[PDB]
Amino acid sequence: MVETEPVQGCRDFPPEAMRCRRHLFDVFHATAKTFGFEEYDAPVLESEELYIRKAGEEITEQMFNFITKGGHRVALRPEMTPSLARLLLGKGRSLLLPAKWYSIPQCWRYERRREHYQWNMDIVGVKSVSAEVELVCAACWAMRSLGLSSKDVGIKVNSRKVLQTVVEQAGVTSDKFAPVCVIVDKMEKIPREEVEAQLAVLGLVDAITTTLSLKSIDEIAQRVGEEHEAVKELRQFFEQVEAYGYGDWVLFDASVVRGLAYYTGIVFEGFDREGKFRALCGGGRYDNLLTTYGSPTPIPCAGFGFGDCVIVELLQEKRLLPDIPHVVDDVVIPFDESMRPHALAVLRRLRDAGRSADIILDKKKVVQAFNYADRVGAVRAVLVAPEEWERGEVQVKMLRGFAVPLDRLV
Amino acid sequence: MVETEPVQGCRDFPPEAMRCRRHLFDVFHATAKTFGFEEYDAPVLESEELYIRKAGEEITEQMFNFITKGGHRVALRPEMTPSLARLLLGKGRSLLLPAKWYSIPQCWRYERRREHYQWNMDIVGVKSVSAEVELVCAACWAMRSLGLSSKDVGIKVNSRKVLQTVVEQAGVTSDKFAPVCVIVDKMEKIPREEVEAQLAVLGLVDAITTTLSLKSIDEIAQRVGEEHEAVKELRQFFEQVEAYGYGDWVLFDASVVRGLAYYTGIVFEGFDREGKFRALCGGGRYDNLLTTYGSPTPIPCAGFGFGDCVIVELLQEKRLLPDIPHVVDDVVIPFDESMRPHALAVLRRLRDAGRSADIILDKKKVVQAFNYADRVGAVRAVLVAPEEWERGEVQVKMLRGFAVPLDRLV
Ligand SMILES: N[C@@H](Cc1c[nH]c[nH+]1)C(=O)O
Ligand SMILES: N[C@@H](Cc1c[nH]c[nH+]1)C(=O)O
Ligand SMILES: CSc1ccc(N)cc1
Ligand SMILES: CSc1ccc(N)cc1
Secondary structure (H helix, E strand, O other): OOOOOOOOOOOOEOHHHHHHHHHHHHHHHHHHHHOOOEEOEOOOEEEHHHHOOOOOOHHHHOOEEEEOOOOOEEEEOOOOHHHHHHHHHHHHHHOOOOEEEEEOOEEEOOOOOOEEEEEEEEEEOOOOOHHHHHHHHHHHHHHHHOOOOOOOEEEEEEEHHHHHHHHHHOOOOHHHHHHHHHHHHHOOOOOHHHHHHHHHHOOOOHHHHHHHOOOOHHHHHHHHOOOOHHHHHHHHHHHHHHHHOOHHHEEEOOOOOOOOOOOOOEEEEEEEOOOOOOOOEEEEEOOOHHHHOOOOOOOOEEEEEEEOOHHHHHHHHOOOOOOOOOOEEEEEEEOOHHHHHHHHHHHHHHHHOOOOEEEOOOOOOHHHHHHHHHHOOEEEEEEEOHHHHHOOEEEEEEOOOOEEEHHHOO | OOOOOOOOOOOOEOHHHHHHHHHHHHHHHHHHHHHOOEEOEOOOEEEHHHHOOOOOOHHHHOOEEEEOOOOOEEEEOOOOHHHHHHHHHHHHHHOOOOEEEEEOOEEEOOOOOOEEEEEEEEEEOOOOOHHHHHHHHHHHHHHHHOOOOOOOEEEEEEEHHHHHHHHHHOOOOHHHHHHHHHHHHHOOOOOHHHHHHHHHHOOOOHHHHHHHOOOOHHHHHHHHOOOOHHHHHHHHHHHHHHHHOOHHHEEEOOOOOOOOOOOOOEEEEEEEOOOOOOOOEEEEEOOOHHHHOOOOOOOOEEEEEEEOOHHHHHHHHOOOOOOOOOOEEEEEEEOOHHHHHHHHHHHHHHHHOOOOEEEOOOOOOHHHHHHHHHHOOEEEEEEEOHHHHHOOEEEEEEOOOOEEEHHHOO
């Protein structure tokens, strides 16, 4: 007997499970359309080089990589953003800006689950914080579309420029900034003795702790100035999100850095207000990535990723994922095999009119055909019997036996 | 500068291309719903064992496989059907039958393109040819939904039981039947001297050629009998497809075997009636696969695969793939940055009412905002200016400047 279980750390999606996933994706798609984002895709298999950033990131530590038979180093994408950048670079001057691109790629890791789907939304060619605002509102919009309120979740928001200044003022060559954000991001999970050790292990702390634990924007105006670009940006951000109507969804948190190397400005993180779950989504501005990839002109970018697992746990906890049973409008039941041809002509017309319809495919008695119709969640059973066919009719019966002329069925 | 090109033999899908792919997938999805099929998915990464059938298949010759870091032999699926079977086996008795499952997996190969998307439709637990009928009608339905007529394409249909008998009558142990179908399938591409050599290389021909070139069902009634199960099946098949209204789409071809090992009965192949393109889709009955995988009870199955490339070439040839430009209902234009907050409250309401809307994100003059709106295919531009806002109004303008009160916009 064969191995019925999927490969280590990956999920099967039989119809029941697939309905749950499709309910989630519908929202991701519907939200992108609402916000004017265009869909894209790229291979799940990308060159390994694409992710060699050399900043001790979890995402590049836990790459699911291998060597092709022909020698080339490739990998199953751990994230989409580098793929996006490559596409953007290839377009170059032909790419009209600003561009708003989205996708729902499966992304991978080797280690616990080894794959997840991650909704990606990104805005390209927008200098101002209006990008981050839109993005953050898109994420709130989706969560709200799934049944969640500002009582259930929020989005913590920060800027890396604050810390950039503190690092810069402290004489630290700017090349150390990315490795620092990555360690500081660990602060949540690892202890302060362990996190302090990594910053010292990178050749160096006090000012970092104090600034991470600042609880308000006023307090960072004290420390940095009321027109550090970061203060002006965050105020504009919050004012814009206020104005869009999602003020109760967003708040400031000076400890939020995110784990990725390329964020340069505003960064953000979705969370459940009960403190039970990991981050629901994560994102930020990344204005230098494309310059890093070799763009002859800097290209401002911002975006986020929004996983398919934490959100589902959350929705299951809040009882917002009722099992969605399969449905179909009509189930056509031939009285017996001599009626099959006629049953098919009826099936054809039901479908021609835009309805979803089955026909009983195997041979069985009418009552068992009816039970089957109930089991597949048919809204209506259409019995095709010889007596009624003579009258140009069939027997209809609503499941959620009046005879009906064929033309009136639809 | 980074490598902008995708990995060898795989496709990027920027927004333009993705619109074409989504137009195709919409049809695959819409057709499955019309026919009552339920969506499923499974990992693109499956155990390599799953595909070791030992019958010289192209699909298992050109497996994109590798060894995980932990030693396990895995591969990127070359086809979905084995995944489907595994899922079905795992369900066992809990799986209610008949089941009609579909998916649009990316599938892989190593060698020319190395990936394609393949719509899969399969019916489980149906003994009779009504399964093959439904499946064949689903494929015609999709092609017709894409603009194609029975003048443009057809479906060639055969049964492997015919050849099974000829092989059986000729004393050939039934274990040789699969290897034979695989060689005979090559007959299209390779010469008869080369195809004859493989059948002799498998320890053995004349009767095979003659029966492959039989041009009608009557002629196979002569050779096999008018109640070989295969004659009764094909007549039922054609009668049912006749009755559904797709008689002009289907025809008999005794040379059609298909390249896969597991087909046991009816097999079929979509084709363009101009003889320009490879097969558009392919499928058949496979009643023994699950018994092969270890099912304690035989499970009848039939299905097909329908690629994303040949169909697109065909549609491009018939001029049925006009470029689909991006669209969005509204583009909200703040007169200047002081109007941004108000512009956002308007944006919120447009979206709240189910419309797709952008807001101009960067700072620019109104005429350039208008050009942008035209470029993204906005149906309507909504200017948010201070003079009109005082009146509780905005300036609307249809692109495919009458002032309007906020409540009337939606
Ligand atoms: N790539 C980020 C999310 C993101 C998309 N765009 C910008 N950031 C992540 O995987 O968490
Ligand atoms: N797996 C077949 C198509 C198919 C699906 N179900 C049965 N046959 C192919 O790749 O051509
Ligand atoms: C849970 S599977 C997963 C895969 C890739 C990343 N970057 C994170 C998580
Ligand atoms: C054109 S890519 C492709 C991938 C897998 C199979 N079986 C066939 C084709």
